[model samples]
Target: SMGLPPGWDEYKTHNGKTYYYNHNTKTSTWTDPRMSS
Candidate 1:
């Protein structure tokens, strides 16, 4: 695995909330971390 870049979590969040999603990557999905999956 590789280290995440700056604002990686933000990028993922953006994708999840926005329409810029990646069907290949699961991380592209939004995760609250405070709630269930």
Candidate 2:
């Protein structure tokens, strides 16, 4: 499931730094992709 708008892209760094571009907000951000069980 995604809240991002259509045509959004996901990017990651060489060290596995994962994140995405928020088209509506016109900004790039780093998010914690970890989940606590």
Candidate 3:
């Protein structure tokens, strides 16, 4: 949520927004889908 990067390797790009992938759950997560797109 905050600008500070998550524990995982994370970065944001122009087109594709980077998601923090949780190895434990095997799923990616972002706060708001609308904000990214």
Candidate 4:
């Protein structure tokens, strides 16, 4: 399981889409689950 800092919400989809929402600012972000090192 993953954790978040306070005042944040999150969601993830099976299609490699992840989202992080900041409730304090009423803003959110999206991230591609695929990554390369």
Candidate 5:
């Protein structure tokens, strides 16, 4: 289940939580885009 969305990268942030970065959108979000999209 490591299929990261295009331009979206997964990484570890604080409190053992996961965060995602969007290169295309040029922004960041904690919610995973992979599941929704």
Candidate 6:
């Protein structure tokens, strides 16, 4: 019921594509872990 999987944050690539990052878990992904489920 939230934007990210719990501890995830957001960022942008050099090409200007939006992406995701989780500082707590030290994880990163090109796709959002929220909307697909």
* Highest lDDT scorer: 5
Q: Would you list the rank order by TM-score, best first?
A: 5, 6, 4, 2, 3, 1
lDDT of 1 by residue, 1-37 (tens): 4334222332434334721223335444354322323
Winner by TM-score between candidate 6 and candidate 2: 6
Q: Write the per-residue lDDT of candidate 2 for residues 1-37, one digit (tens) a residue.
A: 8644563456896786667666765756665323210
Where in model 3 is the C-alpha error above 4 Å?
Answer: 1-14, 32-37
Name the candidate, 2 or 4, with the larger lDDT value. Answer: 2
Against the unseen true structure, what C-alpha lDDT does each candidate score?
0.36, 0.56, 0.47, 0.55, 0.78, 0.73
lDDT: which is higher, 1 or 4? 4
Error (Å) of candidate 3 at residue 6 is: 9.7
Candidate 4 on 1-37: residue-level lDDT in tens?
4455564566875775577666777656664223211
Off by over 4 Å in 5: none
- Cα RMSD, each candidate: 7.4, 5.5, 6.1, 6.1, 2.6, 2.7
Per-residue lDDT of candidate 6, residues 1-37 (tens digit): 5768677767899997677887877877777867641
> Which digits, one per residue and each the tens of the lDDT, describe model 5 over residues 1-37?
6577678998888885678888998767788887763
Per-model TM against the reference:
0.21, 0.39, 0.33, 0.46, 0.61, 0.61
Q: List the residue pairs that clash in candidate 2.
A: none
Clashes of 1: 0
Which stretches in model 2 have alpha-carbon errors above 4 Å? Answer: 1-3, 23-25, 32-37
The TM-score measured for candidate 6 stands at 0.61
Q: Worst ten-residue run, lDDT, model 3?
A: 3-12
Per-candidate total of colliding backbone pairs: 0, 0, 0, 0, 0, 0
Model 2 lDDT at residue 1: 80
